[PDB]
Homo-oligomer: A and B are copies of this chain.
Amino acid sequence: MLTYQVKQGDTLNSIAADFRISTAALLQANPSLQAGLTAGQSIVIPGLPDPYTIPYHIAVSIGAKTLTLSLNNRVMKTYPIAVGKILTQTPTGEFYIINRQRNPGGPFGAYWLSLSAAHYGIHGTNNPASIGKAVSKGCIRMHNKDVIELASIVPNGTRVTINR
């Protein structure tokens, strides 16, 4: 039920990477007319619910270094985060939670949550002193306790809006 407006300069492969699925399996499969990329038209992304049915909404502020979880347009919890360096920034715009994996370990800490930009996610950390700072390669980092909490709550498909 998740529908994605293919933007200009999207290829089929960059869309499949962003959403962590294959170019065939449904991408072409879910969308039959995929017979030439079409900027401004809409395709479905097979594994995910319609994100407007998920009453959760995550809002990231790069400047304030906060991630805020809302439920039905009321903020519920706000957490401190690390964000990307000035030369390796966290990207702005509209994303979704795609995937998760518990206890990846290393610099990814207690949890990974994929965002709908290839190679980007929200994750924990084994460098807790880094939270609150512009320090990362582009991912949003959280104290382990908070990412565990966030992952416990939000389903795949949840909207993540990132602003400066």
Using a CB–CB distance below 8 Å, which chain A residues touch chain B? 1, 3-5, 7-8, 39-42, 44, 50-53, 57, 59, 61, 63-66, 68, 70, 72-75, 78, 94, 159, 161, 163-164
Each complex incorporates copies of this chain amounting to 2
Least distance between A52 CB and chain B CB atoms (Å): 6
Contacts of A5 in B (CB 8 A): 57, 59, 61, 68, 70, 73-75, 161, 163
* Contact among B4, B64, B68, B75 for A73, CB-based, below 8 A: B4
> Can you show 15 pairs from A to B with CB atoms below 8 A apart?
A1-B73, A4-B73, A5-B74, A7-B61, A8-B61, A40-B63, A40-B74, A41-B68, A41-B74, A41-B78, A42-B59, A42-B72, A42-B73, A44-B73, A52-B52
Given the interface pairs A7-B163, A42-B59, A59-B42, the reply to whether A50 lies near B73 with Cβ below 8 Å is yes
Given the interface pairs A7-B163, A70-B3, A72-B3, the reply to whether A39 lies near B64 with Cβ below 8 Å is yes
Least distance between A69 CB and chain B CB atoms (Å): 10
* Contact among B7, B66, B161 for A40, CB-based, below 8 A: B66
Least distance between A55 CB and chain B CB atoms (Å): 10
* Contact among B41, B50, B72 for A75, CB-based, below 8 A: B41
Alpha-carbon distance between A50 and B52 when the two chains are bound, in angstroms:
11
